[PDB]
Scaffold this active site. Structure first.
Site, PDB file in Angstrom:
ATOM      1  N   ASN A 124       0.834  -1.196   0.000  1.00 26.47           N
ATOM      2  CA  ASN A 124       0.000   0.000   0.000  1.00 26.47           C
ATOM      3  C   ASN A 124       0.867   1.243   0.000  1.00 26.47           C
ATOM      4  O   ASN A 124       0.582   2.212  -0.680  1.00 26.47           O
ATOM      5  CB  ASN A 124      -0.905   0.047   1.233  1.00 26.47           C
ATOM      6  CG  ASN A 124      -2.064  -0.923   1.151  1.00 26.47           C
ATOM      7  OD1 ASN A 124      -2.538  -1.259   0.065  1.00 26.47           O
ATOM      8  ND2 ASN A 124      -2.543  -1.364   2.310  1.00 26.47           N
ATOM      9  N   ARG A 153     -10.743  -2.025 -14.804  1.00 24.32           N
ATOM     10  CA  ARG A 153      -9.601  -2.869 -14.490  1.00 24.32           C
ATOM     11  C   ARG A 153     -10.115  -4.300 -14.397  1.00 24.32           C
ATOM     12  O   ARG A 153     -10.796  -4.665 -13.432  1.00 24.32           O
ATOM     13  CB  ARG A 153      -8.961  -2.455 -13.164  1.00 24.32           C
ATOM     14  CG  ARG A 153      -8.331  -1.075 -13.179  1.00 24.32           C
ATOM     15  CD  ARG A 153      -7.446  -0.873 -11.959  1.00 24.32           C
ATOM     16  NE  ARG A 153      -7.764   0.368 -11.262  1.00 24.32           N
ATOM     17  CZ  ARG A 153      -7.012   0.905 -10.305  1.00 24.32           C
ATOM     18  NH1 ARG A 153      -5.885   0.310  -9.923  1.00 24.32           N
ATOM     19  NH2 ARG A 153      -7.388   2.040  -9.727  1.00 24.32           N
ATOM     20  N   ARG A 173      -5.631   3.247 -13.376  1.00 22.48           N
ATOM     21  CA  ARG A 173      -4.513   3.643 -12.510  1.00 22.48           C
ATOM     22  C   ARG A 173      -3.283   2.752 -12.685  1.00 22.48           C
ATOM     23  O   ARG A 173      -2.180   3.249 -12.908  1.00 22.48           O
ATOM     24  CB  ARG A 173      -4.944   3.672 -11.035  1.00 22.48           C
ATOM     25  CG  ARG A 173      -5.593   4.992 -10.611  1.00 22.48           C
ATOM     26  CD  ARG A 173      -6.032   4.980  -9.151  1.00 22.48           C
ATOM     27  NE  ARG A 173      -6.673   6.238  -8.769  1.00 22.48           N
ATOM     28  CZ  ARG A 173      -7.304   6.444  -7.614  1.00 22.48           C
ATOM     29  NH1 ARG A 173      -7.385   5.471  -6.714  1.00 22.48           N
ATOM     30  NH2 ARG A 173      -7.860   7.623  -7.358  1.00 22.48           N
ATOM     31  N   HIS A 188     -15.523   5.270 -14.765  1.00 18.14           N
ATOM     32  CA  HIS A 188     -15.407   4.390 -13.620  1.00 18.14           C
ATOM     33  C   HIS A 188     -16.674   3.587 -13.336  1.00 18.14           C
ATOM     34  O   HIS A 188     -16.656   2.665 -12.527  1.00 18.14           O
ATOM     35  CB  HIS A 188     -15.001   5.231 -12.403  1.00 18.14           C
ATOM     36  CG  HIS A 188     -14.526   4.434 -11.228  1.00 18.14           C
ATOM     37  ND1 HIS A 188     -15.290   4.251 -10.095  1.00 18.14           N
ATOM     38  CD2 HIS A 188     -13.354   3.793 -10.998  1.00 18.14           C
ATOM     39  CE1 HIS A 188     -14.608   3.532  -9.216  1.00 18.14           C
ATOM     40  NE2 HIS A 188     -13.429   3.243  -9.739  1.00 18.14           N
ATOM     41  N   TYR A 195     -12.578  -7.903  -2.240  1.00 16.13           N
ATOM     42  CA  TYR A 195     -13.298  -6.651  -2.070  1.00 16.13           C
ATOM     43  C   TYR A 195     -14.767  -6.883  -1.892  1.00 16.13           C
ATOM     44  O   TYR A 195     -15.333  -7.774  -2.520  1.00 16.13           O
ATOM     45  CB  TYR A 195     -13.148  -5.778  -3.310  1.00 16.13           C
ATOM     46  CG  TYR A 195     -11.752  -5.368  -3.636  1.00 16.13           C
ATOM     47  CD1 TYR A 195     -10.666  -6.128  -3.215  1.00 16.13           C
ATOM     48  CD2 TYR A 195     -11.506  -4.223  -4.385  1.00 16.13           C
ATOM     49  CE1 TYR A 195      -9.387  -5.756  -3.526  1.00 16.13           C
ATOM     50  CE2 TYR A 195     -10.227  -3.847  -4.704  1.00 16.13           C
ATOM     51  CZ  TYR A 195      -9.172  -4.614  -4.271  1.00 16.13           C
ATOM     52  OH  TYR A 195      -7.903  -4.210  -4.582  1.00 16.13           O
ATOM     53  N   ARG A 209     -13.678   3.870   4.612  1.00  9.09           N
ATOM     54  CA  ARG A 209     -12.539   3.031   4.921  1.00  9.09           C
ATOM     55  C   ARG A 209     -11.209   3.661   4.611  1.00  9.09           C
ATOM     56  O   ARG A 209     -10.237   3.356   5.275  1.00  9.09           O
ATOM     57  CB  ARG A 209     -12.638   1.669   4.215  1.00  9.09           C
ATOM     58  CG  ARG A 209     -12.138   1.685   2.809  1.00  9.09           C
ATOM     59  CD  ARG A 209     -11.125   0.600   2.579  1.00  9.09           C
ATOM     60  NE  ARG A 209     -10.220   0.995   1.502  1.00  9.09           N
ATOM     61  CZ  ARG A 209     -10.536   1.045   0.211  1.00  9.09           C
ATOM     62  NH1 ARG A 209     -11.749   0.706  -0.200  1.00  9.09           N
ATOM     63  NH2 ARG A 209      -9.633   1.467  -0.666  1.00  9.09           N
ATOM     64  N   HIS A 219     -15.149  -2.213  -0.041  1.00  5.76           N
ATOM     65  CA  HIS A 219     -15.055  -1.418  -1.240  1.00  5.76           C
ATOM     66  C   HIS A 219     -16.380  -0.879  -1.820  1.00  5.76           C
ATOM     67  O   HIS A 219     -16.349   0.006  -2.644  1.00  5.76           O
ATOM     68  CB  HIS A 219     -14.319  -2.255  -2.290  1.00  5.76           C
ATOM     69  CG  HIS A 219     -13.987  -1.492  -3.525  1.00  5.76           C
ATOM     70  ND1 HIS A 219     -14.912  -1.241  -4.519  1.00  5.76           N
ATOM     71  CD2 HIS A 219     -12.849  -0.867  -3.907  1.00  5.76           C
ATOM     72  CE1 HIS A 219     -14.354  -0.498  -5.456  1.00  5.76           C
ATOM     73  NE2 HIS A 219     -13.100  -0.255  -5.109  1.00  5.76           N
TER      74      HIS A 219
HETATM   75  N1  LIG Z   1      -7.602  -4.923   4.104  1.00  2.79           N
HETATM   76  C1  LIG Z   1      -7.255  -5.026   2.781  1.00  2.79           C
HETATM   77  N2  LIG Z   1      -7.573  -6.174   1.967  1.00  2.79           N
HETATM   78  C2  LIG Z   1      -7.197  -6.224   0.650  1.00  2.79           C
HETATM   79  N3  LIG Z   1      -6.491  -5.289  -0.043  1.00  2.79           N
HETATM   80  C3  LIG Z   1      -6.203  -4.144   0.786  1.00  2.79           C
HETATM   81  C4  LIG Z   1      -6.444  -3.943   2.156  1.00  2.79           C
HETATM   82  N4  LIG Z   1      -5.927  -2.695   2.633  1.00  2.79           N
HETATM   83  C5  LIG Z   1      -5.348  -2.204   1.551  1.00  2.79           C
HETATM   84  N5  LIG Z   1      -5.478  -3.052   0.412  1.00  2.79           N
HETATM   85  C6  LIG Z   1      -4.982  -2.757  -0.932  1.00  2.79           C
HETATM   86  O1  LIG Z   1      -5.402  -1.358  -1.351  1.00  2.79           O
HETATM   87  C7  LIG Z   1      -5.775  -1.445  -2.809  1.00  2.79           C
HETATM   88  C8  LIG Z   1      -7.080  -0.922  -3.152  1.00  2.79           C
HETATM   89  O2  LIG Z   1      -8.005  -0.020  -3.403  1.00  2.79           O
HETATM   90  P1  LIG Z   1      -8.661   1.029  -4.405  1.00  2.79           P
HETATM   91  O3  LIG Z   1      -9.648   1.161  -3.315  1.00  2.79           O
HETATM   92  O4  LIG Z   1      -7.449   2.066  -4.656  1.00  2.79           O
HETATM   93  O5  LIG Z   1      -8.824  -0.145  -5.425  1.00  2.79           O
HETATM   94  P2  LIG Z   1      -9.393  -0.231  -7.032  1.00  2.79           P
HETATM   95  O6  LIG Z   1      -9.291  -1.728  -6.842  1.00  2.79           O
HETATM   96  O7  LIG Z   1      -8.255   0.552  -7.688  1.00  2.79           O
HETATM   97  O8  LIG Z   1     -10.852   0.464  -6.922  1.00  2.79           O
HETATM   98  P3  LIG Z   1     -11.386   1.883  -7.539  1.00  2.79           P
HETATM   99  O9  LIG Z   1     -10.932   1.718  -9.017  1.00  2.79           O
HETATM  100  O10 LIG Z   1     -12.947   1.779  -7.546  1.00  2.79           O
HETATM  101  O11 LIG Z   1     -10.712   3.114  -6.881  1.00  2.79           O
HETATM  102  C9  LIG Z   1      -6.123  -2.861  -3.140  1.00  2.79           C
HETATM  103  O12 LIG Z   1      -6.018  -3.345  -4.498  1.00  2.79           O
HETATM  104  C10 LIG Z   1      -5.408  -3.738  -2.091  1.00  2.79           C
HETATM  105  O13 LIG Z   1      -4.354  -4.469  -2.581  1.00  2.79           O
HETATM  106 MG   LIG Z   2      -7.814   4.299  -3.641  1.00  2.00          MG
HETATM  107 MG   LIG Z   3     -10.268   4.677  -5.836  1.00  2.00          MG
END
Ligand SMILES: Nc1ncnc2c1ncn2[C@@H]1O[C@H](COP(=O)(O)OP(=O)(O)OP(=O)(O)O)[C@@H](O)[C@H]1O
Ligand SMILES: [Mg+2]
Ligand SMILES: [Mg+2]
Ligand SMILES: Nc1ncnc2c1ncn2[C@@H]1O[C@H](COP(=O)(O)OP(=O)(O)OP(=O)(O)O)[C@@H](O)[C@H]1O
Ligand SMILES: [Mg+2]
Ligand SMILES: [Mg+2]
Lengths: 687, 687
Positions: free
Chosen positions: A44, A374, A404, A434, A467, A563, A591
């Site tokens: 992260n 994605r 991203r 999105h 998620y 979150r 998510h």
């Molecule tokens: N508790 C958790 N369990 C799983 N992954 C986590 C956790 N905390 C952090 N992560 C990581 O943070 C990243 C995710 O989030 P984001 O919310 O940026 O994802 P996206 O999959 O890019 O969704 P969006 O496109 O809708 O923003 C994840 O892909 C994951 O690997």
């Molecule tokens: Mg994010």
């Molecule tokens: Mg996001």
């Protein structure tokens, strides 16, 4: 600033990853899961720098050009501050977890802790299995690591010493072709489970690597890792009045993506300087000393050597029994009978994949339109969409090749699509699509009936298992027609359009949300019951936070389950007294997104693909759907009820970013994700 | 023709694959190995059509254009003849082997032999694991299988019957994403080991596949497979006086690669016609009915369900102990001390990979040149060559991107090479570089010493384990200098050149060989001991066969060990009375090449990369090396002695193409490959 009204999103983001660290420290979690959380945390943070930090470096750059009035540095200081403090805790947890594994008969040791027996085993194990992947890269004056040096790979920079002579070579840790953790042979008792890091195998075998062609008195290795800032894209999605008059010294100063480089602390200065010159480490590039091991994100896949106790017990993704009723002859019959709501990962993503597959060959299906932001590697979805094309259905695939990370992949997710006959549409330069949608149009005895899917998470197979996300499958025309307009909107955004049910960024959004907050505001001031309950991943938009503040101050009950980043500060006397903010970080990455408005008593429930960030309201195509079937609405409310009653993983959001846990009064000990699973399990029981 | 003086290469090739079939029928071989030979046989035949047959179709095409005097049809008839006869025997062996597996508790059954219990298991196993990969491809008027229909994939063409109505759909057998053999649950006793072919799982589940969206009375499936003739390349490597005046109606008639299509015999005619129109099956395209199952080449990977008895016991590739002597500090020291000869797969190919890797980083190594014809997937060699480039060595890589099958792969084996700084050289349009060479030049206290490798087989990691091949590693300048010229020759073939040790096609070859045969001829006629012993994969060149005939007729003892095509007819009264021809087909594919000439008594021994085919003498760059070290010369002779004394796998070559086995008189029962392994094992024993 005198009494911060908002929190910096970046700092709040750090507070969030900190919450992830808490999971690694939570003794209630299985030992190996905790070790793996160290991996998630690291990963992260890596993502944090490559993107969010990089995004910030450019926001200050744009600002300073003509002059910035904000206290940029006061932020970078805090960031760098909190980061180092967390790093300190990381090591504490790491060492702490190593010891606990030792008590569990798992020993992760290094080259300086080998039995004069296991060493022999390693030397042999090295020739037979590793040497072949390890080839010394000699650093000479005309050598230029710059080019062929892999990004994010860990390199062992070796110091070849012969008298007062010093040569340098690099060893690439081949974490791609070999397990990063090798099991050693138990020295004496059979109680042991000793393992060693691949990096340390190389440290022990350095001699075996060079003795063949080098003369030397000593060999010293120092680990290093190189990283590169993410391609400037997310920052130009905001330059409106700025980039319409932007300077050309701000374009070469904004697009220049710097290079980062971390190296083991002891790295002798001479070497550090050698590497610097080789990597053209300019002024805006960064050199950082940071420990023996890098890429702690490999721990995400730390093997479970011991018993099942060390790992969480699987929560088998359930089938939505409704789809398997004998009365239904296929997905469509099920969806036409009643709207369907799936909540992953409690449910299988399998149902959506099945429907899309069925859709690809059902002779009565005429067209299929779908959003790809994605997708998984070699999506079964991409596959079905191609099959559909072959079967003559008209297939349109909107692809956000400007995602991203899973972006360069959505570009190849095109040559075959179009080649098969799929009409592809791409995301306009700085405007991401999105929305999680797909529309199926099929003939049902004369008429054209549409089936639509509106989700909160993307069509990603792996993701669907880590998620939490909702998936709405409906044939309700009120919604089906509007989802048709969204796609037409995407193809031709020049023609004006209006939506009566769906919230659509950046057409509906702000006006529609302000309208709903303002309605609760009105009701409260008139003594009518009110309330705003939100489940988002991020809450940062100025206008919306101010709106929520206005609601609290107006007597409106605001409950937030955010979150990730939350700039809104709850409980500020006379500003947010009625706002209760919590965050839940657990086994499943929360998510999904929901907006609930009391609405005088006739509750409005929306599931959305948009967080409350400015980009999600005015610079992207997003979609939120209300829930018209009262049965599903209630289902979501029950789930929300469960979430807000969590007293095990729920953490409070406060201005101190304390991440204090929600104390359980004499109220039931409740763990949302587990209870939710029970609830969904409870729904999938034989009619 | 009145008394055939030569045998058609194609027919001889069929005699060879027939020898492969014999291994499937040889009860002395382990049951499952025999089953796997059915796979090799099939795969060989597939290759036969795609290439050799296709090559022939074009040779007759070129011929007939202005008119051909040869009896082309009399050949195609024989070919088609022998092919069908062998096919008959194939089925006999197949059924025979199914039964023998039954006696071994292994039962391969079909959908019509399922227990009213295993069916249930399959239906369930199908939804849970296969449905996802099986998507019906509806054949409609505007559908065009032509394009998106995978080559060499097996398709289940289904017949959807509703009243007098008939629809058609195709089911792709996903042999790529699923095991082609699924294990079923033992009906009653635990003695069972019942398995079923993936194709038959689909046949049983057809209903489950269509009931969802189709109304029908009956569903019938018929297997089919499509193939495409190999890209016309091997045929233009011979058009000299023909293509310098060739017509443009012979260029569009020679390059037009036809399409083949085999389908299950019962396929109703209507369907066969549907498929025809869809695949544009012209005049020069072929439609052939041929059984329920296609792609028998999957049996090459038939799983060993039973005990180790059913499979050959591994013959662990040996290390050439010489390389591990403490006295040597690396590969080079070993090779500079004595020339090294490795015979795969008895030996490991590991030694060559090690040396190339060492070469890539030894600071004293200045350059590396190497030939790449067909390398393994992601060659460790390509890797080392790139590492070498990074380390600043001057790396030249001659790549034959015009190979036979592993060709399109040697084209990408370029973007990275050149990008890393490797000077690449490609094969001129219709002239292949088949030589197996590599040259390393390194500084040894002032002087530049060269190390060279001349092989009979290519630098292929997997191959090195199934093919017998020699590898000469030398530092002998007499040979090292000439190998240097070969590479300079390849880069600049305009400058005249001469070779005094090496045989180099197409510069030295014919003259050098004729010279040697003629020398034996002279000696015999003078009562001097003589002899020509050859170990080749194919013997087809006119001038050379005639030369050997001349030698026999002249009193010269000619011993031939040809494993593939041999047009020379041995034992023709007054023509080849002194020629003894045998072929050995066993567990290891005999692939090495050697030429031995008595030479009055001072035996000349050559290891070569060239078979005695015209293309290998006048149209390709090939290399044969003499063996100057008498110790290695003797080593090869011992191995040859062993080969010609084989009385278990050796087959005679005769004009009847009988493939009769060599009877063992009262001479030791000998199995070459096993004895050879003993001999090599015998050499690798602690000094
Ligand atoms: N508790 C958790 N369990 C799983 N992954 C986590 C956790 N905390 C952090 N992560 C990581 O943070 C990243 C995710 O989030 P984001 O919310 O940026 O994802 P996206 O999959 O890019 O969704 P969006 O496109 O809708 O923003 C994840 O892909 C994951 O690997
Ligand atoms: Mg994010
Ligand atoms: Mg996001
Ligand atoms: N007994 C066997 N074992 C393994 N493969 C076999 C056998 N019999 C026939 N073959 C197949 O026939 C094919 C070829 O041999 P050839 O002797 O043409 O191969 P190469 O290794 O491609 O050499 P060249 O460079 O001279 O073309 C091989 O590619 C191989 O897979
Ligand atoms: Mg070939
Ligand atoms: Mg070949």
């Amino acid at each position: 600033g005198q009494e911060k009204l908002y929190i910096e999103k970046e700092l709040s983001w750090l507070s969030f990853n900190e919450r992830v660290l808490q999971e690694a420290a939570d003794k209630s979690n299985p030992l190996i899961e905790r070790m793996r959380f160290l991996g998630i945390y690291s990963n992260n943070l890596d993502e944090f720098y490559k993107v969010r930090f990089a995004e910030l470096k450019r926001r200050i750059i744009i600002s300073e050009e003509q002059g910035s009035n904000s206290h940029s540095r006061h932020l970078l200081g805090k960031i760098q501050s909190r980061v180092l403090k967390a790093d300190q805790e990381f090591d504490g947890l790491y060492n702490e977890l190593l010891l606990e594994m030792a008590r569990n008969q798992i020993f992760l040791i290094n080259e300086r802790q080998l039995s004069v027996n296991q060493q022999n085993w390693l030397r042999h194990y090295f020739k037979q299995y590793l040497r072949q992947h390890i080839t010394p890269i000699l650093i000479n004056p005309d050598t230029d690591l710059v080019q062929f040096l892999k990004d994010d790979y860990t390199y062992l920079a070796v110091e070849i010493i012969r008298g007062d002579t010093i040569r340098y070579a690099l060893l690439e840790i081949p974490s791609d072709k070999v397990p990063r953790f090798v099991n050693l042979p138990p020295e004496a008792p059979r109680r042991r489970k000793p393992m060693i890091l691949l990096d340390n195998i190389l440290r022990y075998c350095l001699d075996d690597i060079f003795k063949g062609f080098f003369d030397y008195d000593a060999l010293n290795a120092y680990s290093m890792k190189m990283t590169r800032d993410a391609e400037y894209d997310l920052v130009h999605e905001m330059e409106a009045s700025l980039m319409e008059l932007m300077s050309s010294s701000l374009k070469q100063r904004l697009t220049a993506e710097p290079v980062r480089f971390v190296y083991q602390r002891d790295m002798p200065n001479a070497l550090v300087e050698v590497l610097r010159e080789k990597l053209t480490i300019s002024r805006y590039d960064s050199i950082v000393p940071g420990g023996r091991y890098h890429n702690f994100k490999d721990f995400i896949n730390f093997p479970n050597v011991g018993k099942a106790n060390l790992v969480n017990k699987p929560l088998p993704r359930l089938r939505h029994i409704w789809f398997d009723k004998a009365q239904f002859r296929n997905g469509f019959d099920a969806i036409r009978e009643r709207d369907v709501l799936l909540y992953y990962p409690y449910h299988t993503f399998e149902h959506v994949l099945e429907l899309l597959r069925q859709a690809s060959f059902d002779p009565s299906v005429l067209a299929i339109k779908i959003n790809i932001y994605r997708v998984a590697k070699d999506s079964r979805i991409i596959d079905s969409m191609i099959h559909a094309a072959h079967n003559g259905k008209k297939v349109t695939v909107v692809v956000e090749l400007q995602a991203r990370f899973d972006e360069e992949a959505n570009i190849h997710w095109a040559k075959r699509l179009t080649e098969a006959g799929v009409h592809v549409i791409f995301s306009a330069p700085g405007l991401k699509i999105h929305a999680k949608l797909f529309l199926i149009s099929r003939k049902e005895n004369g008429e054209v009936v549409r089936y639509a899917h509106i989700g909160t998470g993307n069509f990603n197979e792996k993701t669907a298992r880590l998620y939490t996300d909702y998936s709405l499958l409906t044939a309700d025309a009120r919604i089906t027609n509007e989802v048709r307009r969204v796609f037409n909107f995407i193809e031709n955004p020049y023609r004006p359009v209006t939506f009566d049910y769906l919230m659509v960024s950046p057409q509906n959004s702000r006006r529609l949300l302000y309208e709903m907050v303002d309605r609760e505001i009105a009701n409260a001031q008139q003594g009518l019951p009110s309330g705003i309950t939100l489940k988002l991943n991020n809450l940062v938009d100025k206008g919306l936070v101010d709106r929520l503040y206005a609601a609290s101050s107006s007597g409106v009950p605001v409950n937030l389950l955010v979150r990730g980043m939350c700039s809104l500060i709850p409980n500020l006397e006379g500003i947010s007294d009625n706002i209760r903010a919590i965050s839940i970080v657990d086994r499943y990455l929360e998510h999904d997104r929901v907006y609930i408005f009391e609405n005088g008593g006739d509750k409005k429930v929306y599931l959305s693909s948009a967080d409350w960030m400015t980009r999600n309201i005015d610079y992207r195509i997003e979609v939120a759907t209300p829930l018209l079937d009262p049965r599903l609405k209630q289902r979501v409310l029950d789930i929300i009820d469960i979430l807000f009653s969590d007293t095990v993983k729920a953490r409070y959001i406060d201005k101190e970013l304390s991440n204090r846990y929600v104390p359980r009064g004499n109220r039931r000990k409740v763990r949302a994700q587990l209870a939710i699973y029970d609830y969904i399990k409870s729904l999938e029981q034989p009619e």
